[PDB]
Amino acid sequence: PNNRYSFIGGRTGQWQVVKIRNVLGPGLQLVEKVNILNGAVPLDSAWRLQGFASNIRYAIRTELEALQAVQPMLNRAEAILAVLIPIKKSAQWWEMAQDERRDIFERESHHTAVGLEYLPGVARRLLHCRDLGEEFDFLTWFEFAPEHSSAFNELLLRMRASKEWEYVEREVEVWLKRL
Amino acid sequence: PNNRYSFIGGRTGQWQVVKIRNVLGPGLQLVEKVNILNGAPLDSAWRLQGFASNIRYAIRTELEALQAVQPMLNRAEAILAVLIPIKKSAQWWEMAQDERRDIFERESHHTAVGLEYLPGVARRLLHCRDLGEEFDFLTWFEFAPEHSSAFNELLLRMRASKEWEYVEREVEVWLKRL
Numbered sequence: 071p072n073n074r075y076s077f078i079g080g081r082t083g084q085w086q087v088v089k090i091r092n093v094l095g096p097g098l099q100l101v102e103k104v105n106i107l108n109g110a111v112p113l114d115s116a117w118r119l120q121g122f123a124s125n126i127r128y129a130i131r132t133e134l135e136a137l138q139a140v141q142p143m144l145n146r147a148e149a150i151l152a153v154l155i156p157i158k159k160s161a162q163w164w165e166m167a168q169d170e171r172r173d174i175f176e177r178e179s180h181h182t183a184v185g186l187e188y189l190p191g192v193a194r195r196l197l198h199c200r201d202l203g204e205e206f207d208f209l210t211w212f213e214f215a216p217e218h219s220s221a222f223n224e225l226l227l228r229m230r231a232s233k234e235w236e237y238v239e240r241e242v243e244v245w246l247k248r249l
Numbered sequence: 250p251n252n253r254y255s256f257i258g259g260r261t262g263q264w265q266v267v268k269i270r271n272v273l274g275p276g277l278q279l280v281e282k283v284n285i286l287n288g289a290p291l292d293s294a295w296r297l298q299g300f301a302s303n304i305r306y307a308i309r310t311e312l313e314a315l316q317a318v319q320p321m322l323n324r325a326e327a328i329l330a331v332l333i334p335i336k337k338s339a340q341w342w343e344m345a346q347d348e349r350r351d352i353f354e355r356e357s358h359h360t361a362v363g364l365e366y367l368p369g370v371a372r373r374l375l376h377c378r379d380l381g382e383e384f385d386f387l388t389w390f391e392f393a394p395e396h397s398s399a400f401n402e403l404l405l406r407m408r409a410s411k412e413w414e415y416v417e418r419e420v421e422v423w424l425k426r427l
């Protein structure tokens with residue numbers, strides 16, 4: 071539907087693949103371009119990822135207000151670089167209660183506080199796909215100007231050192247350049 | 250996916266429709282039976298679908314209390330079932346996580362009230378807003394005939410809660426197991 075998005079790796083698309091880092095677990099086959107389509111769905115395509123936009127799961131009102139105060143819009147003119155990061159979390163994560171996951175997410179890991187410092191440099195989108203039976207749980211999307219490449223790379227090193235990332239069992243970085 | 254379930258109202262299925270009460274908003278056309286399929290035909294009036302998902306509000310202490318009393322599905326005695334599709338308003342979904350949790354339990358005592366009716370009533374929760382469905386949730390309950398009066402009481406207590414001020418559409422589909 072309107073909230074469903076598909077990412078198709080192949081020879082066509084609006085984004086050129088700069089590199090793919092297989093951070094953790096099985097990776098994705100290297101391709102020339104990524105085609106992004108609004109909806110569900112590839113002759114010379116190597117892989118296909120899909121997720122949906124959904125409601126807030128963890129952020130509290132005060133956190134949303136801070137985010138909504140500075141987060142930039144998508145498709146900025148200077149935002150020619152983008153990074154697609156599919157992520158999967160362990161079964162131990164999904165069996166835990168809501169309060170247990172909230173505490174790890176922000177209290178122990180400060181996911182929102184840490185990321186909020188890298189705005190408005192980085193725009194972001196979050197898509198869910200575990201409920202669709204996909205091989206990943208989330209598709210995360212970030213786009214920024216080349217100036218913030220080092221800053222974004224620093225954020226990744228920090229996030230991957232948090233308690234939350236002890237439950238990440240698969241992760242891939244797909245670096246993209248807008249055409 | 251095997252977490253997906255479809256409910257097909259028509260002339261075939263494992264459950265006979267006893268009654269359909271259109272509580273709030275547009276209802277569902279009355280049919281003869283409901284067929285349940287684990288996954289995603291002619292002579293079918295409507296199809297509803299949803300998926301099982303992770304916990305969204307319950308805290309550990311509440312999960313422990315539920316797991317200590319909640320019964321399993323498919324009890325021999327539980328020949329009655331009720332399918333209640335629900336849709337919540339757009340104002341509900343725009344709220345933050347803490348705002349919705351506070352309405353759900355602090356103000357409405359959803360879990361505390363519901364616990365008073367276990368182990369008599371077995372339950373299942375399916376999500377479908379994210380699939381673009383006309384409802385947000387498909388809730389399933391099954392129980393022996395002795396608990397039908399208690400279940401109607403539960404419904405009235407729930408619909409008087411703060412949480413239900415955000416329900417925009419609700420239908421009751423009473424079923425008997427064939």
Ligand code: HEM
Binds near residue numbers: 125127155182210225
């Ligand atoms: C750069 C600024 C960032 C900000 C402001 C930010 C903020 C947030 C917020 C508020 C949520 C919670 C959404 C909700 O409540 O439903 C979230 C979820 C998430 N973020 Fe970020 N984040 C950032 C960067 C990142 C990065 C760099 C990654 C991965 C490399 C990432 C991966 C995730 C994942 C996987 C989730 C979902 C976790 C779950 O639901 O279990 N985020 N982010």
Ligand code: HEM
Binds near residue numbers: 337404
């Ligand atoms: C009979 C005993 C009941 C118990 C033990 C119970 C318990 C619960 C619990 C713990 C949740 C939270 C699940 C989560 O955190 O993801 C929940 C969600 C829900 N329940 Fe119940 N409940 C009962 C009866 C009912 C009834 C009678 C209805 C409707 C007529 C109902 C409708 C719902 C809905 C719609 C949700 C999802 C709410 C949302 O996510 O916004 N429940 N229930």
Ligand SMILES: [Cl-]
Binds near residue numbers: 289
């Ligand atoms: Cl689908």
